[PDB]
Subunit: 141 residues, 4 copies
């Protein structure tokens, strides 16, 4: 079915001037952009956005990185969007993405495990939480 | 348990200059205001906000009224907030509110069934949907 | 002439549960509320908002205080709003406000010079800058 | 000097899937994106945004077009940004842009005079007004 999912272009990709190319990729893959904005997570907000990872070892590093500069979020809509977007971005380790998924966003724009260019919702459950975390219904147009 | 619910101060109450008194009431009742903003529904957004009522006979009138001028929404937080807030606002017919719940917001500020001063989420399910419709997680502070 | 000015209800007044009463005062004084929202200044944004004071001795305390909790901003519109609102809020030292302007907002709700309940734009120039700092044209309704 | 200017990607360009490529162009030209969002002008807001054109013959058509669908606004920052961005987008008639400025945004993505892909601020004065119209200081990051 037609689904919505959330992506966030991370500060590493922002700084590399990859934003336009990344959005273009999703457009070329056939997704409609239903919401879009640049903003900055406070550490507290990044922490809440990533609450499911609180007890993971990478958590503090992730929260700091995701609040270290401006990011851009977008709601993408399309057939089977959650699964397809997940596949389009590729493995979370950018270097591994270059090895096993060379045409993935992370392969193309990611640097390593932490600076891996982009975030996308993992599941229907997380897409619902993440989309509402960033965008109200008023912002989806 | 501690809950969150949504209220919307409608254009009739806005025009009566009731906004301050209405917020004050919820503050005196012990709720924390977690989000607040003045905005204007487009007819399309009002219709989406009230989608559960789309097949009801009052729908078009409701949509038109709720898009006829600026409104103010707030997220209220407190123990059993969803049902307590319903009770504080009173019966949806303002005249009936004066008869059976004379201390209610609708008895005090409402005119009739259409101009009834204020909206509040009806259930936990509707609260979840309505809060996200108006406010993102980024707007809850 | 009809003018617009900005007020911000500070964390001390928020915590005292004064928000509703303060908005009500401006409503009773005859102002139209043209924009309204609860948000939280980051330290950096508070500093930018108060940039004219950057070299003043109270700056760091002001920036820290105004970023220590959520605040509520409003755009108020009316004849001579800028000076009338200044007069309604009273002297910046709340204790002095009680001595020389006992009916002022700061006399009623303010504690001292730092916790003084409320901010209002100082001049037409600062009003223009402050309104744009907090609200876009899209948020004025 | 370093300046800020506003662009808006219009509904024609949005529908052609040009958003990513258009932002990429500005990134490659060396501009920093300081604010970004998708939204929809109401006809009233489009009319206020374009107030300087109220008495022009194209006004109603422009207002209707610019409120006919979602658009994306961005604040661009860079050396001499206002003049450079104005030149990058090219003549307002897209067909003429193809004739005299073939590498311009309007030549590349514009259709005709009305559907001409993009808007950019014309002057320092209009840039200031247009930026504040769309984005608050809180949204510039």
């Amino acid at each position: 079915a037609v689904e919505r999912t959330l992506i966030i272009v991370k500060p590493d990709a922002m700084e590399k001037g990859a934003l336009g190319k990344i959005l273009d990729r999703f457009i070329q893959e056939g997704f409609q952009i239903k919401a879009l904005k640049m903003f900055r997570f406070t550490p507290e907000k990044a922490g809440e956005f990533y609450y499911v990872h609180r007890e993971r070892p990478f958590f503090q590093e992730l929260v700091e990185f995701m609040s270290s500069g401006p990011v851009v979020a977008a709601v993408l809509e399309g057939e089977d969007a959650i699964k397809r977007v997940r596949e389009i971005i590729g493995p979370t380790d950018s270097e591994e993405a270059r090895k096993v998924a060379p045409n993935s966003i992370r392969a193309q724009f990611g640097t390593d495990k932490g600076k891996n260019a982009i975030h996308a919702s993992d599941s229907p459950e997380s897409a619902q939480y993440e989309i509402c975390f960033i965008f109200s219904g008023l912002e989806i147009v």
